[PDB]
Amino acid sequence: IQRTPKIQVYSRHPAENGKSNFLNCYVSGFHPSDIEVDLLKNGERIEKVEHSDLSFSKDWSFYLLYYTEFTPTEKDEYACRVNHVTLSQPKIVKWDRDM
Amino acid sequence: GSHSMRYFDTAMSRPGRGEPRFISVGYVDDTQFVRFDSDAASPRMEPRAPWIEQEGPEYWDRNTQIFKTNTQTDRESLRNLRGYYNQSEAGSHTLQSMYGCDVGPDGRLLRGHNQYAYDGKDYIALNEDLRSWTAADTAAQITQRKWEAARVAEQDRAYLEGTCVEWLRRYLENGKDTLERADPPKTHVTHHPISDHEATLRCWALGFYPAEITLTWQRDGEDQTQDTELVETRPAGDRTFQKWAAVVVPSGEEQRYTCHVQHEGLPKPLTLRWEP
Amino acid sequence: ELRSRYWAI
């Protein structure tokens, strides 16, 4: 029984353009624990991204938080791209600062 | 209130990508307090709470020894499971388990738990007797007869009814600083127009530590549901949490709706509205 | 504390 990953993209603190912050990609509810996730800056792989220690939920699905330090700036796109055996192609989720 | 202890166990075969990986994570009241890992190459990222280093290396190297013997058992488990399902040796599979005990305000054991999954699917579980088993399929039926013949439920029960609750009361006392932390959320309401006829109210809860929290929108003091959307609580990354809850109100009636926040860190539940 | 687990699946 494999489960597809859910994905939220968000900031540790309220986004203030010009204020340093943390970009988060929280991927949860996926079962086969092997998962590949990147955070992008205008469609381009950020290199200094880290992640929490792999854990799983009461329903056996795994979850992980990938994070990086950043500073947003109105004409700046940010996103999370995740690949997983359940996914036909890499699912990209764009970061909306109001969510 | 009522307390819980659980170990979450994970064992994964990696034919070729190195060799099996083993993880055991321990929880008191959903607070992670110990983490064992066959991949961890330094105990800095084999984390444990302060009141675990408090116990000395005569409770690390014992538990490290248990963990290491436990993985021999998990090694056979994975091989037997491959056989029960006639799986190939080149495939990766995942054995998981959750076990532990629930105690009441004093420590009256209330319930014991032990269950397993194979590749994400319930496999076998110890019923609430702690004396009998529920199998999921023929594989687990095989497991059940051998565990009936070896009298495993009795040993599981001894741990759950003994070691489990007696070590849990020790943890509850020794780590009560760390365990009942409880930082209250900071809350605000934002507004997002869609139609000329409509907007969306979003109620934000930020920086609360015990991940349990309840957000509720209500119209003239009446709880609402499906026109109300709820995002799943997410970690912020600083050992705190975020959540929000939205509702699509008809433009002009915004001051009808109020957001109710309930959380351990609050003297009393908060009520908020949109403030333009 | 960890359960000592000796019996395989």
Burial class (CB in 10 A: 0-12, 13-18, 19+), B121: middle
Q: Do B99 and C3 touch (CB under 8 A)?
A: yes
User: Closest by alpha carbon to A83, among A22, A11, A32?
Assistant: A32
3-state secondary structure of B172: helix
Q: Please report, for chain B, the start and end positions of each structural domain, with discontinuous segments joined by +.
A: 1-181, 182-272
* Closest residue, chain C, to B63 (C-alpha): C2
- Chain B interface residues facing chain A, Cβ-Cβ under 8 Å? 8, 10, 12, 23, 25, 32, 35, 37, 45, 47, 92, 94, 96, 98, 117, 119-121, 190, 192, 202, 206, 231-232, 234-238, 242, 244
CA distance B144 to B152: 9
* Residue burial B252-270, b: 16+ Cβ < 10 Å; e: rest: eeeeebbbbbebeeeeeeb
User: Closest by alpha carbon to B100, among B109, B112, B110?
Assistant: B112
Q: Is B260 within 8 Å of B270 (Cβ atoms)?
A: yes
CA distance B183 to B238: 12
DSSP B85-154: TT--TTS--EEEEEEEEEE-SS--EEEEEEEEEETTEEEEEE-TTSS-EEESSHHHHHHHHHHHHHTHHH
Contacts of B41 (CB under 8 A, 6+ apart): none
Q: Is B96 within 8 Å of B125 (Cβ atoms)?
A: no
Q: Is B187 within 8 Å of B203 (Cβ atoms)?
A: yes
Query: How many other CB atoms sit within 10 Å of the CB of residue B274?
Result: 18
CA distance B140 to B59: 34
Angle at A94 between CA A89 and CA A97, to 5 degrees: 160
* Closest residue, chain B, to C1 (C-alpha): B167
At residue B122, φ and ψ (nearest 5 deg) are: -50, 135
3-state secondary structure of A46: coil
3-state secondary structure of A37: strand
User: Closest by alpha carbon to B213, among B177, B254, B243, B250?
Assistant: B243
B236 touches chain C (CB under 8 A): no
A60 touches chain B (CB under 8 A): yes
Spacing of C-alpha B186 from chain mean position: 24
User: Closest by alpha carbon to A57, among B27, B101, B70?
Assistant: B27
CA distances from B230 to A17, A72, B111, B217, B227 (A): 27, 26, 31, 10, 10
- B174: part of which helix (H) or strand (E)? helix B165-174
B175 touches chain C (CB under 8 A): no
Query: How many other CB atoms sit within 10 Å of the CB of residue A44?
Result: 10
CA distance A20 to A89: 32
B80 touches chain C (CB under 8 A): yes
**Distance (Å) from the C-alpha of residue C6 to the closest C-alpha of chain B?**
6
Residues of B in contact with C9 (CB under 8 A): 76-78, 80-81, 95, 116, 118, 123-124, 143
* Residue burial B76-115, b: 16+ Cβ < 10 Å; e: rest: ebbebbeebeeeeeeebbbbbbbbbbbbeeeeebeebbbb
- A39: part of which helix (H) or strand (E)? strand A36-41
**Residues paired with residue B97 on neighbouring β-strands, in sequence order:** B9, B116
* Method of structure determination: X-ray
Q: Do A55 and B25 touch (CB under 8 A)?
A: yes
CA distance A67 to A23: 5
Q: Which of C4, C7, C9 to mutate to test the interface with B (most CBs of B within 10 A)?
A: C9
CA distance B246 to B249: 9
Q: Among all chains, which residue has been given the structure tokens 């994070």?
A: A67
Given B7, B59, B150, which is nearest C7 (Cβ)? B150
- B3: part of which helix (H) or strand (E)? strand B3-12
Q: Do A26 and B121 touch (CB under 8 A)?
A: no
Residues of A in contact with B192 (CB under 8 A): 98
CA distance A1 to A59: 11
Residues of A in contact with B8 (CB under 8 A): 55-56
Q: Are chains B and A in touch, 3+ Cβ pairs below 8 Å?
A: yes
Resolution for the entry shown, Å: 2.0
- Give B32's DSSP letter: E
B63 touches chain C (CB under 8 A): yes
B67 touches chain C (CB under 8 A): yes
Size of interface B-C (CB pairs under 8 A): 52
Residues of B in contact with A26 (CB under 8 A): 234-235
Size of interface A-B (CB pairs under 8 A): 61
Structure tokens at A6: 């859910």
Q: Do C3 and B152 touch (CB under 8 A)?
A: no
Q: Do C3 and B26 touch (CB under 8 A)?
A: no
CB pairs under 8 A, 24+ apart, for B117-123? B117/A60, B118/B81, B118/B85, B118/B93, B118/B94, B118/C9, B119/A1, B119/A31, B119/A32, B119/B93, B119/B94, B120/A1, B120/A2, B120/A3, B120/A31, B120/A32, B120/A60, B120/A61, B120/B94, B120/B96, B121/A1, B121/A60, B123/C9
